[PDB]
Amino acid sequence: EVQLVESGGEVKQPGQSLKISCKSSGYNFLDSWIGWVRQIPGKGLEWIGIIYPDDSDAHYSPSFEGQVTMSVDKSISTAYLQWTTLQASDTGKYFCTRLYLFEGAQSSNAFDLWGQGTMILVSSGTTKGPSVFPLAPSGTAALGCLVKDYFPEPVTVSWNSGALTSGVHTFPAVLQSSGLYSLSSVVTVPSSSLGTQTYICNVNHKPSNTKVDKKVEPKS
Amino acid sequence: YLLTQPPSVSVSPGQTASISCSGDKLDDKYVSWYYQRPGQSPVLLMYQDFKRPSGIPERLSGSKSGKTATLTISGTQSLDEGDYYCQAWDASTGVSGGGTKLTVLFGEGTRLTVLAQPKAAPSVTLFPPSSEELQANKATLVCLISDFYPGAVTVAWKADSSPVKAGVETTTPSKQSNNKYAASSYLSLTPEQWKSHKSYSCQVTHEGSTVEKTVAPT
């Protein structure tokens, strides 16, 4: 089909180099310009530069000229953006795109085709399993687990081994200023069935192969 | 120049949303519009001011008056929620020559909210540092804001009475398996800070109203 396919998501360190790939297919790779847009997610889209795979004429955004380099390799129909030296700003989801010549009456141009995006996380945090804290309770009550200081995502939280799937809200995680993550997972339960039912949250973080089980006991 | 867009827009289902885009040169530059669902990739919607690319419904329309271009969507639906970006270009031969410099500018975007259910009020569950964490020489305040419609909230922390803006991390909102919204907020402190203050509070402010919760050391 017509599609751009991109390299997978990388976790790099500040100052490491980097090179990402966008393979192209379904059309003449050299006749249509290629594009590189960034998603600083929650933030906007941020155009980086264009290049014409036939001759490699480029146009860098005046914010990446000097910190980023665009190349093309025709025999494998693949486009490249590369850093000599990364830095926390260089973080974001990198999308390569194809610029289309809409040979209309009066002609125009635009990006009809897009890679799935390569995700780049630039940080020094270490791979590290979460510490874990009951969020104890005090017609319905809320208990839950504090899942603190882990890197990188994701943890997975279930409750009572997988017996308890109802009432469970597992919130997205913050990125705290340390460069580490925390999320919480609260169950909403009946008050009466509190001294009764037992409530244990399980927190797997594959990156550090860390499993933790934490019983949430009412306080007093 | 730059493209400006309403950070967000709301239309009731089945109704017409207008999304604007303002730029200092758009009086003479072809605009293009893009779609993006969270997690997914940008979709061309519109190019050369008004031209719908194939596969894009007639209900979406594109216009541009003056330095302002507008994306219009009639017959709005949940399926339309996401972000929308205007783009355009810019050239300039160098005065020293050396060719013509091309630049692709994007708007910052417009989260389109389609108001599929009634205005609801945040559930706030604020938790204090646990014994475990305290025993671990850390302390964390956990503000759980759940169930608000629509999907915006300013959050704030009172250290006793005054705001505190140190050690605060909040999450940009997220939908639920019910379809309202949910975010979390956290305040880091030392077991000292906690111990000494009389209380701390989480201050959610949703749709022209405010609601706070409070905690004090056991």
Binding site: D54, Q106 | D28, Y30, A88, W89
Partner: peptide, 14 residues
């Protein structure tokens, strides 16, 4: 020709 990019109405490139 397959390289040109039309910024807008009247201005043409490559």
């Amino acid at each position: 020709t397959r390289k040109s990019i039309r910024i807008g109405p009247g201005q043409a490139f490559y």
